[PDB]
Amino acid sequence: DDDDKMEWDREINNYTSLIHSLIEESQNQQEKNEQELLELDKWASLWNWFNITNWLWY
Amino acid sequence: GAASMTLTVQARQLLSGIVQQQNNLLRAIEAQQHLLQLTVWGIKQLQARIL
């Protein structure tokens, strides 16, 4: 009971560091995904203009 | 080579970003679950001392 408190603190701080890392990785992957997506809104809209433009069959 | 290559290539890149990002969130939830059981355990020891 003197060395169990510690193990709890050990594991407490390890999973806490792990969650922090994981949210960090997610915050950066979310930045990345919103860029990738912003850039797709554009490519689509772009080509979606030459198409409608030249003539619109079907 | 009609730039539909270019067009789906990014969308391929996106569902790839989205799929990893779900693994990220899943792993976060799992680590949170662990953190949660430590706090439960912790709380059950404080109960099983108040007798």
Residue numbers in the entry:
A (entry chain C): 624 to 681
B (entry chain N): 531 to 581
Give verbatim lines from the article.
HIV-1 employs its trimeric env glycoprotein, composed of the receptor binding domain gp120 and the membrane anchored fusion protein subunit gp41 to enter host cells. Gp120 interacts sequentially with its cellular receptors CD4 and coreceptor CCR5 or CXCR4, which induce a cascade of conformational changes in gp120 and gp41. Here we report the structural basis for the folding of the linker regions connecting to the membrane anchors of gp41, namely to the transmembrane region (MPER) and to the fusion peptide (FPPR).
The structure was solved by molecular replacement and refined to a resolution of 2 Å. The crystal structure composed of residues 531–581 and 629–681 plus 5 N-terminal Flag-tag residues reveals the six helical bundle core with FPPR and MPER extending in a helical conformation resulting in an 88 Å-long rod-like structure. The FPPR-MPER region is only stabilized by few hydrophobic contacts between adjacent chains, including interactions of Gly 531- Leu679, Ala 533- Trp 670, Met 535-Ile 675/Asn 671, Thr 536/Leu 537 - Trp 666 and one hydrogen bond between the carbonyl of Ala 533 and NE1 of Trp 670. A striking feature of the structure is a ∼90° turn of the MPER chain at Asn 677 which positions the remaining residues including Trp 678, Trp 680 and Tyr 681 perpendicular to the rod. We thus propose that the structure represents a late fusion intermediate state rather than the final postfusion conformation, although the latter possibility cannot be excluded.
